Amino acid sequence: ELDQLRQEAEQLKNQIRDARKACADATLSQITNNIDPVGRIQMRTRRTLRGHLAKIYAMHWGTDSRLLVSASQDGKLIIWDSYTTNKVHAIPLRSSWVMTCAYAPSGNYVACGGLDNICSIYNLKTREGNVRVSRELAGHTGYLSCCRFLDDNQIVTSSGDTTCALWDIETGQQTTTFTGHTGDVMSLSLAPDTRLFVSGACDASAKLWDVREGMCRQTFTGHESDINAICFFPNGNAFATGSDDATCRLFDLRADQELMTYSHDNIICGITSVSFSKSGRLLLAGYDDFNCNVWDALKADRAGVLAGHDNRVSCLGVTDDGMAVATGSWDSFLKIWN
Amino acid sequence: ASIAQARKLVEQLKMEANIDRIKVSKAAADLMAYCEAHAKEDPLLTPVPASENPFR
Amino acid sequence: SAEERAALERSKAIEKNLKEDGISAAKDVKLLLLGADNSGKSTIVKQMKITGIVETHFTFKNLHFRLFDVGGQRSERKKWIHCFEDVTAIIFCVDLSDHESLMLFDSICNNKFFIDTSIILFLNKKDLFGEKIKKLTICFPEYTGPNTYEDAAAYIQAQFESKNRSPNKEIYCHMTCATDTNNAQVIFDAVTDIIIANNLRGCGLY
Amino acid sequence: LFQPQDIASMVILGLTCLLGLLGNGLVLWVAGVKMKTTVNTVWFLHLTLADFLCCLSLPFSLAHLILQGHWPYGLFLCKLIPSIIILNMFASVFLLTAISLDRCLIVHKPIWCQNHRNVRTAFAICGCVWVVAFVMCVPVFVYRDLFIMDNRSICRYVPTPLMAITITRLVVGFLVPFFIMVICYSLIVFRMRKTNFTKSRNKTFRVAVAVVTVFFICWTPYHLVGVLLLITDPESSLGEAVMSWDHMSIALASANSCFNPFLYALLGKDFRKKARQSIKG
Amino acid sequence: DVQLVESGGGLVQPGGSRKLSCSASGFAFSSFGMHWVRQAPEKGLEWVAYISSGSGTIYYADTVKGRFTISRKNTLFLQMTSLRSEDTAMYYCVRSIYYYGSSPFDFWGQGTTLTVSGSDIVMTQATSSVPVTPGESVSISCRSSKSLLHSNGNTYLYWFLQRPGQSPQLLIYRMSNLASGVPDRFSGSGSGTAFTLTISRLEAEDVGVYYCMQHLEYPLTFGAGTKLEL
Ligand SMILES: Cc1cc(C(c2ccc(Cl)cc2)c2ccc(Cl)cc2)sc1C(=O)N[C@@H](CCCN=C(N)N)C(=O)O
């Protein structure tokens, strides 16, 4: 009966907890205590692109580490040239409520979405010299929050309907769907192998999906509030998520548990974006407290500050070759550190 | 009514409980090895000379 | 600088176009609609005529009013309410047919992002309220007074006014029975007063 | 060794130049590196720039007073400096009058200020004000000569041109601005006494009377001396009584430049918070 | 689809004047630069005029300055005055759009036959004529006076193909990239001064004449032209 099912669930949870606690022979902090620290890292602003008029909600690097795309709530999605701070394109939108962006790995497509429950696709290499909407996917009920290109013919989306689905930019149909989240999904990230991807809902939990067989594998918990960002370690074996409880955490896939906690007493604001480095040594996190921090990824100690913004930072992301850093805030300014 | 949800939760827990796990020390060693091996091509934790800087 | 001059010219031209469009598109007056399900929003939105964001724009007395409705979003309000920080006002509609509406009004009045946007209050089904009174202390067990139409309506209005905590914002009122189309005039007057106050406070003299 | 009124003038101009330099530089930097060019901040930018430039030019005149004549420079400076000083002063006055007119029009006709108010209009009005100030300050530049007639340069200059210039300066500097300011603020207060302005009408009236009184105190004696000296024949007890205070009359007009940022720019609470935050940088 | 049809050519007496038009349809003509290239009955290609987007910048060649004027719906003009003997040619119309990653000199018109009764970078092609049988691999070389390897790291050499009785088509732009639609058989390379194009598995349709062009700084000078005929 119901009591039997509840007892079985409790026994399964007990087995999972015991297996997770068994593997924690020693902590990462003890092992990393002997290794030398990195000292102090100082970074200075190199450029500043002033084109937008309203708040900025996304910024995605190109595949060649040269071009960038920035999406704002003014109804525009400009395309930048990092090395000379030049505008190359300008794409007006039908809806002014957009809170996502993406940039194709081959450099021929741009995707946007928002509060209208529709994911758009744009064509950059038309023969008539203009940008034309090739497709407009539909079928999601809740607001779309994130979307990434697997390749030139597929796209994965995470919407507010507590579901994630895999599309097809050729026929525009939901090929597969993923279920298991009891709250809004506000963060999605795909592995470098482009075969697995993890997502973060708004009920303090993160799960790992499989694109091929279309089902869940594992569930990680331990936060206290709604997760707002997620990313992958370059090795593809660990991921770090920063919740609204002012604490970033590091999760190991094989160990099936957490490793380190990143907390500072002076900071109480909730993280809005996280991103690793090329060698996996710096975890440059953005904060709602008008500044950015550069945590050492192994010793859990701070190593600098990217101060300079006049409002909350809503995005951050390093390049492909780990040479620059781009952050955009609600003051309508994008700054390229180095 | 809710029996389907309970069955789905039981199936998901059964699937999750069958994974294979390893000691944390191996993963920590892997992280340390990757961090130390690739320390020469990370221009953020090292000051790149202005001659090789395209943003200068 | 062989042919980068052409790219620079293109960038300058599109920047100029962006600035021109941004300035030309900033003269509209935004608004917002909140309330319960079928609590009078339908009557007002049908009176002036014309599942995500639903937008309407009608030009009245040389002022372009844009109206939004977000009733179709069945999710937590704390995840998208910050997008509407810059609205010029907020329109709230309540019906006297029935804590359901006062709780949401108190929540929206005390929100951090809305410490300066005024709320215009509309009441609906006044004669229906009188009929229900004839057929009012159940909805207000703490009501210490006679069960008469005038006193009950006045005390409920005072309860609406009591939830305010921020002096910087003002709450108006208007009575209606979901059968009149005079709301345009009162919306116009309230909006012009709010515009005057906001501009003067921006200049710092207010 | 020094005339006592001249000693008072020297010390008050020293304090004035230090305070005005500090305040004007602070506000200019804050508006330039932190704030944007909104519709209501262009006027403050222009007024602060004019006051800052006048404050920059002031210590040269302080050196003039200290040297007690004996002009050391050529004809070009003897031709240049007074014209630029007068340009800056009259530009400040015109910007003040335009600010008052804008504050009146933002209330009298709200609809017109919703559809036809943008940054370009403000920039155009400021440019027209500046060119009018330049046209007003050119005539002094027209008639500058470096006379010596002695062992040291003695840069100097009833005739009708003097009467014409002094009367037109009196008119355009004192009659029009005062009337426009009083009419605009009277209308603003009268509109504020109508309804829903209970929280206001306490700070508004105080600010209006304070600004108008400061303007009157600063700019009454200058024009009064200008008319009294030329109109009435000099070399009298009244002639001396209008000559002596001339050296100590432009003191208050120049102190108006350092008083303006506190009464106009610093009034805003948001600007106060921004300045306090940026002071720690 | 895309078409630049044009007309306005005919027999003109010496010293006269004539107007030519280059009608354009099928694309966004409002943001595309327009050139004008001419070709004598026997000689190789030349350069005549150019107009940018928005009429901001206009250039002219040495022998045409003052005589002709280029002016810009969806119609382009070129006023011609004081015709002389050398003016007889078949003028073409060429579009071009410039930004990071663009492909200038993409589409060519069809031509309007007209008949009348130093600091310049010089390009040389030694192989005036080359006899090659089908089924073999060929190679063509274009040399220059000044190095075309700018400090940015981009070279500005262009290679064109003009089949018999047709209009030229772009084959290789910036000395290393292949334009859209061209098979991967053609490949071009080089460094600084020596440039060489490599053709693999020559087919019958590849017969024609090949031209070499630079884009370092105006004016633009074509090569002499190599005839890789069968
Ligand atoms: C910047 C500055 C400085 C001045 C000092 C001064 C003293 C010694 C020497 Cl060598 C140089 C300057 C001064 C004090 C008294 C006298 Cl009599 C002359 C000069 S005056 C002055 C200025 O703008 N003056 C004009 C303004 C025209 C308005 N009409 C009036 N004021 N009556 C003026 O002189 O009147």
Instruction: Tell me if residue D49 falls in helix, strand or coil.
Output: helix
**Please, what's the largest Cα pairwise distance for chain E?**
51
Tell me which DSSP letter residue A329 carries: E
Subunits in contact with chain E (3 or more CB pairs closer than 8 Å): A, C
Question: Are D229 and D242 a contacting pair, CB within 8 Å?
Answer: yes
CA proximity to A233, closest of A165, A281, A195: A281
How many CB atoms lie under 10 A from the CB of residue D69? Answer: 11
CA distance, residue C18 to nearest chain A CA (Å): 8
Q: C16 to chain E nearest CA, in Å?
A: 13
Query: Closest chain B residue to A40 measured between Cα atoms?
Result: B45
Nearest Cβ partner for D196 among C29, C63, C193: C193
Cβ–ligand 1 distance for D246 under 6 Å, the answer yes
Cα–Cα distance between D96 and D260 in angstroms, integer? 9
Question: E48: how many CB neighbours lie within 10 A of its CB?
Answer: 20
**CB-count exposure of residue D222 (10 Å: 0-12, 13-18, 19+):** buried
> Can the peptide bond before residue E219 be classed as cis, meaning omega within 30 degrees of 0?
yes
Q: After which residues is chain A broken (C to N over 2.5 A)?
A: none
Output the six-digit token pair for E132: 């090659």
Let me know whether E217 and E131 are in one domain: yes
**Cα D188 to Cα D191: distance, rounded to the nearest angstrom:** 5
Backbone φ, ψ for residue E77 (5° rounding): -130, 160
In this structure, the answer to whether residues E133 and E64 fall within a common structural domain is no
Cβ neighbours for D69, distance < 8 A, ≥ 6 positions apart: D152, D154
- Unique residue bearing structure tokens 């190359």: A88
Cα distance from C13 to chain D (closest Cα, Å)? 18
According to DSSP, the residues that pair with C81 across neighbouring strands are none
Q: Is the minimum CB–CB distance between A139 and chain B shorter than 8 Å?
A: no
Q: Does C200 contact chain A (CB < 8 Å)?
A: no
- Experimental method, per PDB record: cryo-EM
Residue finishing a domain among E116, E131, E163: E116
Position A10, amino acid: E
Nearest of D258, D247, D254 to residue D9 by alpha carbon: D247
Give me the phi and psi of E199, to 5 degrees please. Answer: -115, 130
CATH number for region B3-55: 4.10.260.10
Ligand 1 in reach of D248 Cβ (< 6 A) = no
Number of domains into which chain E is organized? 2
Q: Which amino acid is at E174?
A: R
Q: Which residue has the tokens 């003014």?
A: A74
Half-sphere exposure of D102 (CA within 13 A, CB side): 25
| B24 close to A259: Cβ distance less than 8 angstroms | yes
A60 min Cα distance to partner chain E (Å): 18
Phi, psi for residue A188 in degrees, rounded to 5 = -145, 140
Task: Tell me the C-alpha distance between C191 and C120, whole Å.
Answer: 9
What DSSP character marks residue A211? T
In angstroms and rounded to an integer, the radius of gyration of the C-alpha atoms of chain A is 20
Q: Mapping DSSP to helix (H, G, I), strand (E, B) and coil, where does residue C201 land? A: helix
Beta strands in D47-127 (DSSP E): none
Nearest to A90 among C14, C51, C73 (CB): C14
Residue type, D198: T
Q: Report the distance separating Cα C145 and Cα C192, nearest Å.
A: 37
User: How far, in Å, CA of D29 to CA of D74, rounded?
Assistant: 34
The rounded radius of gyration (Å) of the Cα atoms in chain C is 22
User: Quick check: B53 and A337 in contact, CB under 8 A?
Assistant: no
Q: What is the CA(D156)–ligand 1 centre distance, in A?
A: 10
Kindly report the three-state secondary structure assignment for every residue of chain E.
CCECCEECCCEECCCCEEEEEEECECCCHHHCEEEEECECCCCCECCCEEECHHHCCEEECCCCCCCCEEECCCEEEEEEECCCHHHCEEEEEEEECCCCCCCCCCCECCCEEEEECCCCCCCECCCCECCCCCCCCEEEEEECCCCCECCCCCECEEEEEECCCCCCEEEEECCCEECCCCCCCCEEEEECCEEEEEECCCCHHHCCEEEEEECCCCCCCECCCEECCC
Q: What is the length of chain C?
A: 206
Q: Give the rounded distance of the alpha carbon of C187 from its chain centre.
A: 10
What sections of C54-182 are H helices per DSSP?
100-109, 126-134, 149-162
User: Any idea what the CATH number is for the domain that residue D258 is in?
Assistant: 1.20.1070.10
Whose alpha carbon is nearest atom 33 of ligand 1? D246
| Contacts with B1 (C-beta within 8 Å, 6 or more apart), sequence order | none
CA dist., res. D81 & res. D75, Å (int): 11
Residue type, E103: S
Looking at the structure, tell me whether residues E62 and E143 fall in a common domain: no
Instruction: Indicate if ligand 1 lies below 6 Å from the C-beta of D226.
Output: yes
CA nearest to B9, candidates C61, D130, A6: A6
Secondary structure letter of residue D262 according to DSSP:
I
Q: Which residue among D64, D73, D232 has the greatest number of ligand 1 atoms within 8 angstroms of its CB, and so is best to mutate?
A: D64
Residue of C3, C10, C14 to mutate, testing the E interface (most E Cβ within 10 Å of its Cβ): C3
Residues A321 and A329 sit within 8 Å (Cβ to Cβ): no
Sort residue E27 into left (φ over 0), alpha (ψ -120 to 50) or beta.
beta
Could you give the CA distance from residue E36 to residue D13 in angstroms, rounded to a whole number? 69
The atom of ligand 1 lying closest to the CA of D254 is 1
- Is A186 in contact with A227 (CB distance < 8 Å)? yes
Half-sphere exposure of D259 (CA within 13 A, CB side): 20
> Measured between alpha carbons, how far is E161 from E202 in angstroms, rounded to an integer?
14
CA distance, residue B5 to nearest chain A CA (Å): 10
Q: Which of E4, E74, E99, E170 to probe the A interface (max A CBs under 10 A)?
A: E99
Task: Check CB contact under 8 Å for A88 and E99.
Answer: yes
Q: Which of E54, E99, E215 is opposite residue C7, by nearest beta carbon? A: E99
Residue E76 has φ and ψ, to the nearest 5°, of -115, 145
Contact: B27, A32; criterion CB under 8 Å: no
Asked if A86 lies within 8 A of C79 by C-beta distance, the reply is no
Angle, CA of C162, C164 and C167, to the nearest 5°: 125
Does the C-beta of D5 come closer than 6 Å to ligand 1?
A: no
Name the residue with tokens 């990071």: E100
As given in the structure block, the two tokens for residue E3 are 């078409």
Chain D hits for C170, CB-CB cut-off 8 Å, are: 196
* Rounded (5°) CA angle A113-A116-A120: 35
Indicate whether E138 and E201 sit together in one domain. yes
Can you list the pairs that D230-239 forms with residues at least 24 positions away whose Cβ atoms lie under 8 Å?
Answer: D230/D158, D230/D162, D230/D163, D230/D166
Best of C10, C14, C15, C17 to disrupt the E interface (most E CBs within 10 Å) is C10
Shared-domain flag, residues E98 and E177: no
What is d(CA D248, CA D63) in angstroms, rounded to the nearest whole number?
15
Query: Does the Cβ of D58 fall within 6 Å of ligand 1?
Result: no
d(CA D35, CA A273): 26
Domain limits for position D241: 4-279
CA C100 to chain centre: 18
Output the CA D44–ligand 1 centroid distance in Å: 28
Count of Cβ atoms closer than 10 Å to residue A5 Cβ: 14
Sequence-distant (≥ 6) Cβ neighbours of residue A1 within 8 angstroms: none
With beta carbons less than 8 A apart as the criterion, state whether E4 and E21 touch.
no
Neighbours of chain D (3+ CB pairs under 8 A): C
First to last CA, chain C: 53
DSSP-based three-state secondary structure for A272: strand
- Name residue D14's amino acid: G
Q: Is A302 helix (H, G, I), strand (E, B) or coil?
A: strand
Nearest CA in chain D to C60: D111
Separation CA D14–CA D25 (nearest Å)? 16
Q: Can you give the residue ranges of every domain in chain B?
A: 3-55
Contact D265, D48 (CB under 8 A): yes
- Statement to judge: residues E47 and E32 lie in one domain: yes
Residues E51 and E42: their CA atoms lie apart, in Å, by 27
Helix (H, G, I), strand (E, B) or coil at A330: coil
User: What is the side-by-side order of every strand in the sheet holding A163-166?
Assistant: A144-151, A154-159, A163-166, A176-178
Where in the sequence is the domain holding A229, given as residue range(s)? 1-338
Tokens 């050196």, located at residue: D63
- The structure tokens listed for C19 are 């600035």
* Whole-angstrom distance, CA of residue C36 vs CA of residue C122: 12
Bridge partners, residue A329, by sequence:
A313
* Strand ranges, E, within A76-232: 76-81, 86-92, 102-103, 109-112, 118-123, 132-138, 144-151, 154-159, 163-166, 176-178, 185-190, 196-201, 206-210, 216-220, 230-232
d(CA D118, CA E169) in angstroms, rounded, equals 50
CB pairs under 8 A between C and D: 45
Residue with tokens 């450029």: A47
Where helices occur in C35-182 by DSSP H, the ranges are 41-47, 100-109, 126-134, 149-162
Q: Report how far residue A240's alpha carbon sits from residue A231's, in angstroms, rounded to the nearest whole number.
A: 6
A153 CA: distance to closest CA in chain E (Å): 20
Residue D200: which of D189, D187, D210, D185 has the closest Cα?
D189
C115 touches chain A (CB under 8 A): no
CA distances from A108 to A124, A152, A306, D37 (A): 5, 8, 33, 37
Domain boundary among E52, E83, E116: E116
Nearest-CA neighbor of E63 among E41, E40, E42?
E40
Beta carbon of D59 within 6 Å of any ligand 1 atom:
no
For the beta sheet containing C174-175, the strands, ordered from the edge strand earlier in sequence to the opposite edge, are C54-60, C63-69, C33-35, C90-95, C119-124, C174-175
The resolution in Å comes to 3.6
Which residue's alpha carbon is nearest to atom 10 within ligand 1? D69
Q: Do E131 and E96 share a structural domain?
A: no
Of all helices (H) and strands (E), which one includes residue A60?
Answer: strand A56-61
What is the tally of structural domains in chain A?
1
Cα gap E138→E129, rounded to integer Å: 12
CB contacts, 8 Å: A86 with chain C = 7-8, 11
Find out whether the beta carbon of D82 lies less than 6 Å from any atom of ligand 1.
Answer: yes
Q: Which residue of A has its CA nearest to C22?
A: A53
Nearest residue (CA) to ligand 1, atom 25? D82
Please state, in angstroms and as integers, the Cα–Cα distance from residue A175 to each residue in A113, A116, A211, following that order. Answer: 19, 21, 11
Nearest partner of C32 among C114, C97, C96, C102, judged by Cα: C114
Q: How many CB pairs under 8 A join A and C?
A: 54
Unique residue bearing structure tokens 């827990």: B13
**Pocket lining: D184 vs ligand 1, CB cutoff 6 Å:** no
My answer on whether E133 and E213 are in the same domain is: yes
Q: Which residues contact D71 (CB under 8 A, 6 or more apart)?
A: D78, D146, D152, D153, D154, D155
Ligand 1 center from residue D247 Cα (angstroms): 6
Please state, as a whole number, how many other Cβ atoms lie within 10 Å of the Cβ of residue C95: 22
CB A233 within 8 A of CB A283: no
Chain A's closest residue to C73, CA to CA, is A142
Which among D259, D260, D261, D279 has a CA at the least distance from the CA of D33? D279
Contact call for A235 and B30, based on CB within 8 A: yes
> CA D187 to CA D180: how far, in whole Å?
11
Q: How many domains does chain C have?
A: 1
| CA C109 to centroid of chain Cα atoms | 12
- Cβ contact E57–C5 (<8 Å): yes
The one-letter amino acid at C118: S
End-to-end CA distance of chain E: 32
Buried b (16+ CB within 10 A) or exposed e, D162-176: eeebbeebeeebbee
The gap from C-alpha A186 to its chain's centroid, in whole angstroms, comes to 9
Within 8 A by CB and 6+ apart from A53, the residues are: A72, A74, A332, C18, C22
The total of structural domains in chain D comes to 1
- CATH at residue A193: 2.130.10.10
Neighboring chains of B (3 or more beta-carbon pairs < 8 A): A
Neighbours of D16 (CB within 10 A): 22
Cβ D64 under 6 angstroms from ligand 1: yes
Q: Are residues E161 and E142 in the same domain?
A: yes
CA-wise closest residue to C68 among C107, C106, C33 = C33
CATH number at residue C136: 3.40.50.300
Q: Is A287 exposed, middle or buried (0-12, 13-18, 19+ CB in 10 A)?
A: buried
Ligand 1 near D250 CB (within 6 A): yes
Q: Domain of E97?
A: 3-116
Runs of H (alpha helix) within C49-109: 100-109
Q: Are C27 and D115 in contact (CB under 8 A)?
A: yes
| CATH number of the domain within which E180 lies | 2.60.40.10
| Beta strands across the sheet bearing E69-71 | E6-7, E17-23, E75-81, E69-71
User: What is the Cα–Cα distance from A191 to A124, expressed in whole angstroms?
Assistant: 26
Residue D142 Cα to ligand 1 midpoint, Å, equals: 17
Q: Which helix (H) or strand (E) holds A59?
A: strand A56-61
**Can you spell out the DSSP letters for C4-44?**
HHHHHHHHHHHHHHHHHHHHHTS--B---EEESTTSSHHHH
- The total of other beta-carbon atoms located within 10 Å of residue A184's CB is 21
Cα separation, A196 vs A213, whole angstroms: 10
Shortest CA gap A324–chain B (Å): 8
The reply to whether E67 and E132 lie within a common domain is no
Which two structure tokens, joined as six digits, stand for A190? 């795909």
